[PDB]
């Protein structure tokens, strides 16, 4: 239900300790929670919005030079003086021409010359900064009701959406039939603002960090500035041409729009047209589930004769999904759904739409379950008129251990120490893991910055070669945490 | 003297008439009649498909996208031959002569 | 080489290797730019629509 068919989804179960669990969720993925009760929910972060931005610095992109004036003076007598050097719209440069009697001054030396032209901008590029307050995520919560035609739809108001701010609180979600779920979200430490700048071309906008945005070779201008004429770094958008030793001239230096669309590689695009809608990053959510009902508890079992109305089809991650329809009487009831092996003894393989339900009519209902890694029967009824359905699930024996390992390592490569916040109070394992991971990410962060796709691989191979030829058991520490790790981060970078 | 242009690059362009086309995950690759037109730019990729996408079979279906590439600023690179290349040299003596 | 008003003097093999969409010396309803991929970029966010 809104989770199915979307790739890179993931499962969490275990609400141990109290009645909570830690989940972290990005904008691309969506998270399915499970328990021994407490019906399976689907969480997805759909918006990130910055409400009130304040501009930081306005850069120029396309300029023009009008009122080209120049002035020269005979050699060994000072510098030329010109009234347009006073006003700072005009860009200036001193150079040396050679003069004589043909140049009409005498003394046959190398005179001085100035040139001036006013710097009019006609295309801006403004960056904006936002506080870590006054920003408003939107997370949507969809229970596995198994409702008719509500599966994997990014459309549809089948689930509740709540808006969470750092000025907000425990944020109950009154979603009907199932009770009320509360979320202790941590939105301040989500994507690390007070570094991001939100620069903006004509109709596009990006998300770069502060120390990259400030030191650009474009002529800049501060944010609190009306009458935007006093451009400050004007000499990086003009060229002073003194080809021979004759008089010199000024030129404008084109448009750096497509030049800076080259410069904005590796910087995730956001959508600043109407509202500062981000669609990147994550946030960490503490999820308390003490007040979830089950919506199907205190219903009797079923009479029989179900009917499949849409053929089953496994997804990725090996979870089938079937739509069945009830034919019979006593319509609010459970569904006798179970996956058994051959020869009908063991009930192996679990459900994801746990406690399925027939509701209010003969409306078809969706059931998701996880079969075992071979052939297995599916039993969707009681004994007069069941529905035995064969199913073969490919692989799924040892490849989901290496596949789960690659999902965990990819999560530890994208997320930092926040990747350890995907489980519930390890104590001697989880807190120690993110402590060592945050000091190692601190050391690794104070290196490798500015280093691209290639050079992480290159000096990774260098560190492996220094390891493989060293002695005194520094070789193992010179491979296992630096060499192959920086090669893996060399491959899994620039998403 | 006689320049003949060799090749002209584009500087600033414009994209109109954006069309796209997707298809079911196991059912091969999509195709458009705009794809064989040389004034349209295309690149295959793939999306996620399922019952919410009105598809079935829950996989990764291919997708194409088109756009009519239109230029509006050119850079004509002309070239000349070594003949009809006409220099000009002034000759002047040291006539002791005013100005 | 020629811009709108400015003009340069570059050599051939540098001029032929610039990644930028091109078309031969006769335009005549050109509409046939060759390496068009160097001046567009196709975004596929989230493995959703592109």
């Amino acid at each position, epitope marked *: 239900m809104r989770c199915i068919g979307i790739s890179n989804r993931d499962f969490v179960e275990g609400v141990s300790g109290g009645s909570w669990v830690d989940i972290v969720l990005e904008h691309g993925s969506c998270v399915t929670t499970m328990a021994k009760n407490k019906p399976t929910l689907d969480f997805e972060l759909i918006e990130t919005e910055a409400k009130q931005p304040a501009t930081l610095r306005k850069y120029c992109i396309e300029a023009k030079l009008t009122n080209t004036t120049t002035d020269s003076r005979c050699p060994t007598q000072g510098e030329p003086s010109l009234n347009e050097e006073q006003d700072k719209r005009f860009v200036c440069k001193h150079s040396m021409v050679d003069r004589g009697w043909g140049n009409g001054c005498g003394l046959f030396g190398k005179g001085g010359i100035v040139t001036c032209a006013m710097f009019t901008c006609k295309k801006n590029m403004k960056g904006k900064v936002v506080q870590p307050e006054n920003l408003e995520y939107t997370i949507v919560i969809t229970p596995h009701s198994g409702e008719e*035609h509500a599966v994997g739809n990014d*459309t549809g108001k089948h689930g509740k959406e709540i808006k969470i701010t750092p000025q907000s609180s425990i944020t109950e979600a009154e979603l009907t039939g199932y009770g009320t779920v509360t979320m202790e979200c941590s939105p301040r430490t989500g994507l690390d603002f007070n570094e991001m700048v939100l620069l903006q071309m004509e109709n596009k906008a990006w998300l770069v960090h502060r120390q990259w945005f400030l030191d650009l070779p474009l002529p800049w201008l501060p944010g609190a500035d009306t009458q935007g004429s006093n451009w400050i770094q004007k000499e990086t958008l003009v060229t002073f041409k003194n080809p021979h030793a004759k008089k010199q001239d000024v030129v404008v230096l084109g448009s750096q729009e497509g030049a800076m669309h080259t410069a904005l590689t590796g910087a995730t695009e956001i959508q600043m047209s109407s509202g500062n809608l981000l669609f990147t990053g994550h946030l960490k959510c503490r999820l308390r589930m003490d007040k979830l009902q089950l919506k199907g508890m205190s219903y009797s079992m079923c009479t029989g004769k179900f009917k499949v109305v849409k053929e089953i089809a496994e997804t990725q991650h090996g979870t089938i999904v079937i739509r069945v329809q009830y034919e019979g009487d006593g319509s609010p009831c459970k569904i006798p759904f179970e996956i058994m092996d051959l020869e009908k003894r063991h009930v192996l393989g679990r459900l994801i739409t746990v406690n399925p339900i027939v509701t209010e009519k003969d409306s078809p209902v969706n059931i998701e379950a996880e079969p075992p890694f071979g052939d297995s029967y599916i039993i969707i009824g009681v004994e007069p008129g069941q529905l035995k359905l064969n199913w073969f699930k490919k692989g799924s024996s040892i490849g989901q251990m290496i596949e789960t390992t690659m999902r965990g390592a990819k999560r530890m490569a994208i997320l930092g120490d926040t990747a350890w916040d995907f489980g519930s109070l390890g104590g001697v394992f989880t807190s120690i893991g993110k402590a060592l991971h945050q000091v190692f990410g601190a050391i690794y962060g104070a290196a490798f910055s500015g280093v691209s796709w290639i050079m992480k691989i290159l000096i990774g191979v260098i560190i492996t070669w220094i390891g493989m030829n060293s002695r005194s058991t520094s070789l193992s520490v010179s491979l296992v945490l630096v060499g192959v790790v920086t090669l893996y981060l060399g491959v899994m970078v620039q998403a | 003297k006689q320049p003949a242009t060799l090749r002209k690059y584009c500087i600033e362009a414009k994209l109109t008439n954006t*069309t796209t086309d997707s298809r079911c995950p196991t059912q091969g690759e999509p195709s458009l009649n705009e794809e064989q037109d040389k004034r349209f730019v295309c690149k295959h990729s793939m999306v996620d498909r399922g019952w919410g996408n*009105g598809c079935g079979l829950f996989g990764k279906g291919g997708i194409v996208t088109c756009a009519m590439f239109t230029c509006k600023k050119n850079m004509k690179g002309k070239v000349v031959q070594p003949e009809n290349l006409e220099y000009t040299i002034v000759i002047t003596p040291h006539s002791g002569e005013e100005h | 080489l020629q811009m709108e008003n400015k003009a340069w003097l570059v050599h051939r093999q540098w001029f032929l290797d610039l990644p930028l969409p091109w078309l031969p010396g006769a335009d005549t309803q050109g509409s046939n730019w060759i390496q068009k991929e160097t001046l567009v970029t196709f975004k596929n966010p989230h493995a959703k629509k592109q």
Partner: antibody
Amino acid sequence: EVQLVESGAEVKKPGASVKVSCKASGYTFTSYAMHWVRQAPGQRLEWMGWINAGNGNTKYSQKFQDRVTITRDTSASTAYMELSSLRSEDTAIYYCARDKVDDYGDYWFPTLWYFDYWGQGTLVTVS
Amino acid sequence: SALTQPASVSGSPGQSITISCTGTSSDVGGFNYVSWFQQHPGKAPKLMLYDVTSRPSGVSSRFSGSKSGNTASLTISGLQAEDEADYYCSSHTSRGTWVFGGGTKLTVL
């Protein structure tokens, strides 16, 4: 609970620019799309309207690609349908349609249950 | 490219009537977007059947559809006098355009 109403048009001349609006109520307008389908009397339902959103994009129909333009306004919570270059066969009933936009703003995949609630339709004539 | 449902069908009140639409591989045979409508002559048509077989709220659980390849159907059990309407169809394509059916007139007497 969801109501869509239109603006009545009386009579037009061939070659003019007919215009019909759509006042929307019962929902937030910036999160649902708006379509425009037409039906000649006793004939087939011909799709004209294009996929709108909070930004207001289009998706050009094959038959009506270079003769019709649609606009909207979020501040009045309406959508505008303007067909120009009217010929003799353009007289029909003009319908509206509701569809739910994807939650990321950008709308390409339609809702499974597309075309839920429609307007009553206002007829136009050319002569 | 359109849909080819027949001109007009009729039957006795109480039996089953079938209304089929034959489509191509880009509008019906590939995707699960096919919706049904009914149109009274003094009424705007309302949505009558969802994606292939699913049903709107309201209507009384007797309008069953199917897709048997390139053909999409609408089987109506229990004909009544309130079912005299113009039954049109619709589908969403892979191109991005919506197509529609030709049009069937259903009478009971």
